[PDB]
Each structure stands twice: as C-alpha cells, then as structure tokens.
C-alpha cells in the first residue's frame, strides 16, 4: 500500500536522524571506552553483574536494521551504556568518569534531537 510506503519513508528518515545523533554521541567518547561490547573473554563474570549489556557497535547494528521505532527506544539503549558502566565500575575509575562525561555532554545532543523528532513528526 501507499500508506506502508509512507510509513517506511518516515522510518528511513528517523534512521537518518538517529544515525547523526549516534555519531554526535560517540564523538563524546573519544577514548572509545563504549565503542564495543565488554569482552566476556576478558571480563568473564560480566553477565553476573550486568543483565542487559550495551555499547555503541551494538546500537549501530540495530539502527542499520531500522530497529529503532522512535527516539525513546534509542535513548533507552544509550542510557544502558552509561548506567551499566556506572554500576560495574567504581566512582574512582577512568571508566566511571568517562560515563559521567558522556552522559553530561550527550544530554545537550539528545535535548535537541527530541525537539527535531517532535518537530519533523
């Protein structure tokens, strides 16, 4: 149908906007601490601590499959990156500190993304 096509175009355009959001958020992690999944070879007990792992490569796979239906779902995954790190790692670590900076700096980017998604429908 023409309606299913129009909906597919809306999803494609959301995917385009979220791809730009993801790029901007990932620039706020210049050390690449959140780039890839925590290695279960190197942290073999991680899943005993963290039940829903997340990282920027995993978000990118979901994005490219158009697997985000709205900005809320995308923010949920970004928040897991931050929140998983801040639980697993102690406050006095480079990991925790990197998450705090990513959270603080990403808030700005996400604030305007919310407006652009509401604005452009």
Curated annotation (Swiss-Prot):
Where is it located?
Nucleus; Chromosome
Give each disulfide bond as a residue pair.
none
Give the tissue specificity: Highly expressed in testis.
Superkingdom of the organism of origin: Eukaryota
Q: Where is this cross-link: Glycyl lysine isopeptide (Lys-Gly) (interchain with G-Cter in SUMO2)?
A: 41
**What range(s) does the Bromo domain occupy?**
9-113
Q: What does this protein do?
A: Scaffold subunit of various histone acetyltransferase (HAT) complexes, such as the MOZ/MORF and HBO1 complexes, that acts as a regulator of hematopoiesis. Plays a key role in HBO1 complex by directing KAT7/HBO1 specificity towards histone H3 'Lys-14' acetylation (H3K14ac), thereby promoting erythroid differentiation.
Query: What interactions and quaternary structure are annotated?
Result: Component of some HBO1 complex composed of KAT7/HBO1, MEAF6, ING4 and BRD1/BRPF2. Component of the MOZ/MORF complex composed at least of ING5, KAT6A, KAT6B, MEAF6 and one of BRPF1, BRD1/BRPF2 and BRPF3. Interacts (via PHD-type zinc finger domain) with unmodified histone H3. Interacts (via PWWP domain) with dimethylated and trimethylated 'Lys-79' on histone H3.
Q: What is this protein called?
A: Bromodomain-containing protein 1
Q: Which species is listed as the source?
A: Homo sapiens
**What taxonomic ancestry is recorded?**
Eukaryota, Metazoa, Chordata, Craniata, Vertebrata
Full protein stretch here: 555 to 674 of 1058
């Amino acid at each position: 149908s023409m309606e299913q096509v129009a909906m597919e175009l809306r999803l494609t355009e959301l995917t385009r906007l979220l791809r730009s959001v993801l790029d901007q958020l990932q620039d706020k992690d210049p050390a690449r601490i959140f780039a890839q999944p925590v290695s279960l070879k190197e942290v073999p007990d991680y899943l005993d601590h963290i039940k829903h792992p997340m990282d920027f490569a995993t978000m990118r796979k979901r994005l490219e499959a158009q697997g985000y239906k709205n900005l809320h779902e995308f923010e949920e995954d970004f928040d897991l990156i931050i929140d998983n790190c801040m639980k697993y790692n102690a406050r006095d670590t480079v990991f925790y500190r990197a998450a705090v900076r990513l959270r603080d700096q990403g808030g700005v980017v996400l604030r305007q993304a919310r407006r652009e998604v509401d604005s452009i429908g």
